[PDB]
Amino acid sequence: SQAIKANNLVFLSGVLGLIPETGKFVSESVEDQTEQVLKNMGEILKASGADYSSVVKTTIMLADLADFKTVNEIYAKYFPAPSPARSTYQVAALPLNAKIEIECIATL
Amino acid sequence: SQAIKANNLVFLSGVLGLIPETGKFVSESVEDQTEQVLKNMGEILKASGADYSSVVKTTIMLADLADFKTVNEIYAKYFPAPSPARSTYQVAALPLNAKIEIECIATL
Amino acid sequence: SQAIKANNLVFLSGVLGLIPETGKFVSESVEDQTEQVLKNMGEILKASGADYSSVVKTTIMLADLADFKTVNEIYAKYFPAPSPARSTYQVAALPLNAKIEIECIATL
């Protein structure tokens, strides 16, 4: 599932930058894909009765770590300081050749 | 340790496709190794007083995302929909040159 | 943030082997960086009201899996058996070209 509730916590699946309706990427850019990832994540969090501010942990998996800065600049707009606990690294590849995938854990 | 209990949760280590008693891979194949990972994982879960059905989050680390389609269909037999929250990506390499590693978090 | 508290749990950000005050790597060695990661990690756990012995889950992201052995040696000194649940893999790259990143979850 996209999200699972356990007690105080909610666990979200790794989110790709897809249009919720179509299942296709919003574009090829890491910028649009990142933005879309954060938007989708917001939708899923709020559906679970959480929100951006109740997120306690995130993991950002990147296709290219060189995008780190711009990704971050987008990320910071959704998770401003104080931001959740975070880990970031470059993977060999992501599903559907995505540019970015973000997973997270939040409180209820 | 293979699993650590904390309140309502149990955290499992990343699991490779090894025959538990011998420490060796079931084969050099992703199919066999995935199936084995899921078996071992099951036994650890039930040893902790959990089970496949109480798993809230999983992470699948692959050596090759071409296997992702096969892996999925094996995975689906152990985690039928609605399945746990999940993240999947391809790493540079796994311990002991494994084809697949899976970690998870479950409820007690 | 470096650590987020949620009920019985605390979530730590991925930790690099940096001199905390200066933000610069302790060295370019994986050995020194591993040791430093673990120390910093201890600081962040203690400042949060937790400790090494209350850590329930770790994730070790390596730049080169050949370092595994020595890393695990160093790691073993900070998390002696019985040690936390753990996943380990090699990533394509880490932030600031680090040799090792370690994230963790502990109890309060």
Author numbering:
A (entry chain C), B (entry chain A), C (entry chain B): 80 to 187
Recite the paper's sentences.
By converting the reactive enamine/imines to harmless 2-oxoacids, RidA preempts damage to BCAT3 and ensures that the isoleucine biosynthesis can proceed. In this study, we determined the crystal structures of apo-AtRidA and its complex with pyruvate, and analyzed its structural basis for ligand recognition. The RidA domain retains the basic overall fold, and also preserves the homotrimeric structure with the characteristic interfacial clefts.
Therefore we tried both 2-oxoacid products for cocrystallization studies, and we obtained the complex structure of AtRidA bound by pyruvate. The crystals did not appear to have decayed, but the crystal space group became P1. The three monomers within the asymmetric unit form the trimeric barrel, which is almost identical to that formed by the apoprotein, with an RMSD of only 0.27 Å. Pyruvate binds to the interfacial cleft formed by two subunits, but makes specific hydrogen bonds with only one subunit. The carboxylate group of pyruvate forms the salt bridge with the NH2 and NE atoms of the guanidino group of conserved R165, while accepting another from the OG atom of T167. Additionally, O3 of the carbonyl group receives another hydrogen bond from the backbone of T167. Aside from these polar contacts, the ligand is located at the active site formed by F147, L95 and P174. Additionally, the terminal carboxylate of E180 from the neighboring subunit is only 3.26 Å from the 2-carbonyl group, and hence it is very likely to play a role in the recognition of the intermediates.
